[PDB]
Amino acid sequence: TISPPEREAKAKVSVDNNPVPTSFEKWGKPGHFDRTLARGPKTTTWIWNLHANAHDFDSQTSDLEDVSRKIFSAHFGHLAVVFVWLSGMYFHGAKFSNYEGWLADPTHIKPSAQVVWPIVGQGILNGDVGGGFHGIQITSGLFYLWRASGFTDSYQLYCTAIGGLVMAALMLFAGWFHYHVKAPKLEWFQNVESMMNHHLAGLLGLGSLGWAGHQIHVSMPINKLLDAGVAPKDIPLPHEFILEPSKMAELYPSFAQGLTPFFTLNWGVYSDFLTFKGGLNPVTGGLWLSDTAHHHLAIAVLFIIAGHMYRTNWGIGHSMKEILEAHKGPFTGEGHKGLYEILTTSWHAQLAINLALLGSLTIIVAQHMYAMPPYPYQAIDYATQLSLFTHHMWIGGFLIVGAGAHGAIFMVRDYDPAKNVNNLLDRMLRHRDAIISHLNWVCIFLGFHSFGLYIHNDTMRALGRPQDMFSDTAIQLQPIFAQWVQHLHTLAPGATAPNALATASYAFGGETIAVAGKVAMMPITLGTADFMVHHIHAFTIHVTALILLKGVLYARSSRLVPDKANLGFRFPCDGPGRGGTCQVSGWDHVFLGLFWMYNSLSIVIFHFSWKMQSDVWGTVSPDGSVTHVTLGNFAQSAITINGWLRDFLWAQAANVINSYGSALSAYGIMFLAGHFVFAFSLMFLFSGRGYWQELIESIVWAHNKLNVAPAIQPRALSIIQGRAVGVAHYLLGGIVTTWAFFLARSLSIG
């Protein structure tokens, strides 16, 4: 390949000059990365096993220095993919949307960023969203982001898409470069102190720094005019603000003083745009951008300071090895000793932490965006609110189970017992039965004392006994702690937050902000119907944690299988003996935990969707009264399973089945299609391959009868692959059904 100079300046840089040459001969050789697959396909299973192990780099090569260089370029390729996708959205907003038609009258028109080609009758899918535009009403909330970012013309989105494509090309190029030209050694990687310093000070610090600078120079001075009532064509450009710094000095009183006070510790003077108002914007229904710029500046300073704790080359700083070897108490013996070496060698050990934290943070993103809407006019778009919330729920739900998968992978592949002698991990491996049986008991308890309540309420209301129910009008189960913290957050601006003018969110308690004719956010009164559903959520999460934990604490061995570590991570069983050893591996435990993550989030999203429609969302009268959609029956009807079957499912599913003949017909189609895929998964999940191979035998005889049998002998899916296709189709059908239902229901509420 090419040959650059060196690119270093007394650093820990260490690369290899052209390790892997550039050629196309390996492209025509599928499955070359595996020794077991390179000899050619002899059965059709050879094909499936090709994809099942395409990215598993441990089974391919054993050298870690090769695997890390593969992973780096893989990340670069993923970033190229992501930039391509994002340029897609910017280009569809520039040339296939009505962002300009929506920004003018945002309260009398609906966001849309897709145009369906009129053919074979599908042109009916172009719904009249308002202003003469015909297309699919989007729910990802891109117009709100582009308004909060300062976009006002189509050429801006066009140039954004062009820059996204350029960055995609750059990431794709860097991937090839860091594996075919100068691939880094191990000396460049294992600097976790240095990597943490750089990822805190530079990435998360300077990032929010520059974005706050953007907002102060683009977002704030344009959204201030947008919220006033000025037309977008009369609003100046972002660079006209720097070309004329006086126009910025005047638009904010603090800006009328200069830059020196900031350097001379005169922060309090910049209170005219670095505000702490809180609450929402009465014009758009979203968070104040003057607060978000200040917030990003604070986060920037905090992260840059955090990026100066660990030791690099100038002696100062910490070594995480020291911190881990120091922490040891009388309860855990040696404590964190050996954990630095665990997380500096095993990639799966690192991924089992990163996936868990990233999924939890995605869930936090959903839970924080829904209650403190940060984008303009997103709290009025109930469809966009619900869609962002549920999508960031599902992403995190998957990324969490990924952690429980890669932990078992680390256990089977990278756990060295000689390296873990009486530390945290080794001692946790000792009393596996204690933790697992205690979590078993906890899950049983949470199952009886959360779901049994619903069963008891259904049986009482069915028997005609109202005074024997767990309702707000009988044996009340009032949540005292949540209401107390709600009241705490309500009294914040006048006690434990004198500088704060409004509460963090109006869900805890306070005023009722509403834009146009719909409400943005109001206090979410918590009663019995909320206590019961919260305990349901806790129970489902507990069972999911139990499953995904026994998947890791027993991937090595067990009283049933003492040599399980030999069998690997992914294996169906160990024979029908011992009464039956089916589904004992960590892979099978993840296969089971997928279902329970789905079942937990299925109740979470339904709790959200019904509580919002019943006790929050609703049209506001000009006199002041607020009438909710489902007439506030959640506190009085969500306490029984029949309530959810009738007043939630049967009642709110009518929008989906009656969608034929309209622009929402595709949603009914996909509703039935997910109902189809769900049941299609049951064929795999309830059967076994021993029947399907015997049937393939007869079909092979039939093919050889006419002499039409492929040299690639057909073999039914492996047991593991059967289970994998089953769970994949189960999740796909269920999520497609719920997606279609939620979108058709949220678009049909005005």
Partner: protein, 40 residues
């Protein structure tokens, strides 16, 4: 080189190229002459 000519002729690439070509055929035919429940 032939290394890429063999990759462009693999099973998935060819089975998606044929599907794209047949999709184009069917889509254009039902663009110019749609709504053919039967033969007149």
């Amino acid at each position: 080189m032939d290394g890429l000519k063999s990759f462009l002729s693999t099973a998935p690439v060819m089975i998606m190229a044929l599907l794209t070509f047949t999709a184009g055929i069917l889509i254009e035919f039902n663009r110019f002459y749609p709504d053919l429940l039967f033969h007149p």
